[PDB]
Symmetry: C2
Subunit: 583 residues, 2 copies
């Protein structure tokens, strides 16, 4: 039979194993071996240290599956709309296939977020009469979205940028229009060779950029990423659609991928196993044969016996690839081998994304204190439309965004009310990291060896809780001393995605890359080594996808490999929806 070896039981790896079995590529007698460094709870309460999988982690208050929860990783999806060809098609199809469509609910955001900017409190609808305190004439009386759309249109000009295919084409062929007005960037410049922040800064000045970075929505990415992709993903014609979540958490999707793959494997006679607490240590090729070593979670740097497979999936992000590549980079490898991850073209293409650090603080309260009548600046979570919403509130602080989940349980547990506090960006990673150790304690774990998110959300220190409460007091009262009015959380925990093995909350395409060429060619890295024998060793996950903010991109890269390198029939309608960009 045929053995399929998957390293990483995150979304991409789990989706791959589920498609191989349910799509009927793995037949009776075949083997699927999934290896996961972490110890996720696939088999109910007590079967792991946190719910699955990777950067998706639903966290229930007190670890009570009947309680309110906060998504401590990825939190929402965009429902596929086939009449518009927009939304997370594989996520929507997979939820339906797993029998979970009945649990899909709206994730509603306020039309009138509170903005806390340079010590001013401005509800977004009021900007026409209370201009934002940024020296950016015109733009400061409009939501930041108006400035995003304006900058996008200065970059895209008259180019069609409405469909997914047109957007893909702009990544490679998009040029600044003949009308581009700049001292720095000539008209006709290749937009994919421009940094988004660099050109936003050129066109709107530091105050226009800072206003957009401080007051913009969650989904508009202002880091210095590929300007071609940034323009089409932040503009008027950016992909959109209805935001949804899975009632009871996103993690159940990954529990069901695993359990349904195992039930289908039993019916098909396929040997499907998950081996947790076990990492890929090193990988290399001998012609088409993938050689690899495993390491235990207890001793992650020491490899075991050399194993072989004809089919290997590296279902793991850049920082995780880096740790595997480090294990052979400096080694004296066997004669006739190819140290594939350290080949020059593979290392170059792996740098086709930049990294954004993220930290999430999850706080449960015994009452929804933010709704009290005497709160000076409450979040506007009701009407402004009709349904109830989760916020956010948006600020120029380290605590850059707040979501208010409240009691999102089925109502049978003792009511707790959840708040998600978001810290992001290179600017702030060093700010938040020192809050992770108690003020009475020295650091004990070397930072690059603290695999905190891999194990599960970590108890918030008293310093971290107090800092969050200070920032929420400034947001909702305008007085740091009001932190005394906020009740102490009944539970507070954090996920710091900058730590290994994740090394990032998010990846974004880099400037000075041909995005489509990286998306196409990085998946089978032997293609980036001139003269190499093809091998079925693949790189999959959201990082080198066309949907980097989303589980969708993990599923799409995995699907693209099954289609292109295993000849499988896709479950998607790709007519108007390329899984990854073509060049």
């Amino acid at each position: 039979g045929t053995t399929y070896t998957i390293f990483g039981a995150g979304p991409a790896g789990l989706y791959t194993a589920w498609r191989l079995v349910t799509g009927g590529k793995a037949v009776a007698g075949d083997t699927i071996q999934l290896y996961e460094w972490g110890d996720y709870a696939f088999d109910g309460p007590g079967s792991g240290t946190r719910l699955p999988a990777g950067r998706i982690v639903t966290h229930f208050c007190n670890d009570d599956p009947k309680q309110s929860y906060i998504e401590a990783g990825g939190m929402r999806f965009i429902e596929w709309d086939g009449t518009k060809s927009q939304g997370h098609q594989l996520v929507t199809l997979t939820i339906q296939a797993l029998g979970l469509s009945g649990k899909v609910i709206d994730f509603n955001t306020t039309d009138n977020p509170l903005l806390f900017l340079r010590e001013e409190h401005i509800y977004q609808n009021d900007l026409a009469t209370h201009p934002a305190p940024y020296n950016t004439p015109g733009n400061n009386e409009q939501p930041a979205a108006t400035l995003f759309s304006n900058i996008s249109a200065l970059i895209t000009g008259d180019a069609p940028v409405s469909t997914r295919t047109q957007q893909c084409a702009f990544y490679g062929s998009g040029r600044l229009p003949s009308t581009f007005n700049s001292f720095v960037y000539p008209p006709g410049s290749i937009a994919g060779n421009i940094g988004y922040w660099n050109v936003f800064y050129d066109q709107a000045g530091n105050e226009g950029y800072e206003y957009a970075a401080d007051a913009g929505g969650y989904t508009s990415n202002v880091i210095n990423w590929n300007a071609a992709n940034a323009a089409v993903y932040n503009g008027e014609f950016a992909p959109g659609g209805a935001f949804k979540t899975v009632n009871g958490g996103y993690s159940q999707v990954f529990v069901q991928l695993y359990q349904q793959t195992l039930a289908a494997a039993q019916e098909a006679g396929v040997a499907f196993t998950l081996t947790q607490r076990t990492r890929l240590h090193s990988v290399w090729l001998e012609d088409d044969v993938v050689n690899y070593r495993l390491a235990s979670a207890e001793n992650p740097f020491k490899g075991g016996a050399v194993q072989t497979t004809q089919n290997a999936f590296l279902a793991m992000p850049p920082a995780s690839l880096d740790l595997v590549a480090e294990a052979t980079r400096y080694a004296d490898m066997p004669e006739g081998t190819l140290d594939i991850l350290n080949a020059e073209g593979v290392q170059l293409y792996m740098d086709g994304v930049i990294r954004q650090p993220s930290m999430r603080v999850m706080l449960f309260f015994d009452r929804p204190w933010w709704t009290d009548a005497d709160v000076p600046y409450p979040p506007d979570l009701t009407s402004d439309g009709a349904p109830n919403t989760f916020g956010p509130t948006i600020t120029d602080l380290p605590l850059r965004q707040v979501y208010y989940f409240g009691n999102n349980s089925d109502g049978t547990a003792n009511p707790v009310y959840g708040v998600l506090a978001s810290y992001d960006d290179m600017q702030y990673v060093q700010f938040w990291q020192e809050l992770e150790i108690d003020v009475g304690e020295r650091r004990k774990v070397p930072i690059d060896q603290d695999y905190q998110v891999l194990f599960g959300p970590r108890k918030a220190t008293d310093t971290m809780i107090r800092m969050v409460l200070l920032e929420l007091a400034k947001v909702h009262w305008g007085d740091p001393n009001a932190a005394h009015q906020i009740p102490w959380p009944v539970e507070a925990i954090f996920n710091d995605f900058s730590l290994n093995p994740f090394g990032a909350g998010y990846h974004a395409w880099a400037a000075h890359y041909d995005i489509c060429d990286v998306m196409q060619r990085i998946r089978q890295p032997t293609g980036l080594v001139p003269g190499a024998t093809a091998a079925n060793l693949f790189i999959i996950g959201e990082a080198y996808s066309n949907d980097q903010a989303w589980v969708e991109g993990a599923f799409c890269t995995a699907e693209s490999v099954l289609v292109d390198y295993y000849g499988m029939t896709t479950i998607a309608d790709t007519t108007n929806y390329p899984l990854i960009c073509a060049c």
Copy 2:
């Protein structure tokens, strides 16, 4: 005889060799072997790719030693005052011993810097007339220095913090006063377990922090480093003294260390060799015996045969130590060895500093355009503190500070006029890095393999030059369209210190560390490993010193090792000058 093996011919490694020979520790029949990854010009024109050494690099315009220059790395020092016992003692003694004291000149800074903040132009002397555009009442009418001094006093209370000894003791034992007024931090908290930015932000709010970060002097430092050390180094009572530089460049210190060591070694019968384009690849211990491999610069990841020495100095910063540790971390090491750099206590103490990325753009103009009579906001380089000065101009832009060196040429007929543009901090690294590749081109070198500073200042792209001129136009004209008024530079080059092998402009002691214990014990890392045989393997350099901004710290740690582990008589008077903190 006795062999001394030094890895890294930066300031620390060169100083070590010089002291070993000129102090008479190495005697006739001994050997000193220095290995350097780079290829520095120690022997005049044609002898390397840039002037020595490490993060000190004088850059002459057009590679003309008679032209104006700009320090493309470290630029100034504090002259030792033995009467007050204040300043950079070893740097001053070394310049004197090398015969370079007659090249020492004042490095003067304006007492009335131009501030460009949130699109407003304010000369610092006029903040009473035109308050800084930050919502920080009182603080915004005073120089940022006042706020720095106020915060330091809130942290230090009545603790004496004027002497090196007392500053060292504050790192380990210093506590917030009983009067500390904070929601986040209790009175009496250990200041060394607090992040400086965390507590600044707590006490002064985001607008007070942002004003200090944007408008503070060059030496001011708001990163989230150890609050005990930050309070005593940012306070009214920070280490002071008269700022100087070496006319003709700081690099000639390092040329002269090498040449004079070689001459002295030849007179003494010591074999002194510098082998460049050759790096330490891997290091480990067998009892007291230092085992190592070298790699060529051409093939930096492939080690040669195992070599041994009894005396080894790792004269290289954290990111450089990290690359050497990576080469054994994942290896199956020989029987009876100690993989010293990957020992738990060594890895923990190596994380006792955080890193600050820095980028320097050096621009030479054919005329001092900033002095022209029609310039709306010229720098006040002439009068206010009596003699002429180099600036700076201070801004809230990515281009955070400007220095104006002008014509410092020594005998050209066609002098040029130099400008130093500084970009720093984790916030901006991704902003400046995309300017490093031409707008017509894709990236070609993997970012972690682009050893740019090692080679030498790189030609600025046209996009980088235009960005700097745009920022200088906004600063000096308040009109981005005035960029057309600035003459195109004769030469523009950059040094990005975030790149390997440096991985930082600067290191700063971290929160949640006992600074003194790390300073003392990291130097001989076998002392951090229970059961290990002691070995003469040392870690030296600025990063784990008590003078992290400065060459002084490289010399002090190197001096401390020669005194503590080789029984050498110090050249310093340590009466009021501990080389490193004592515990």
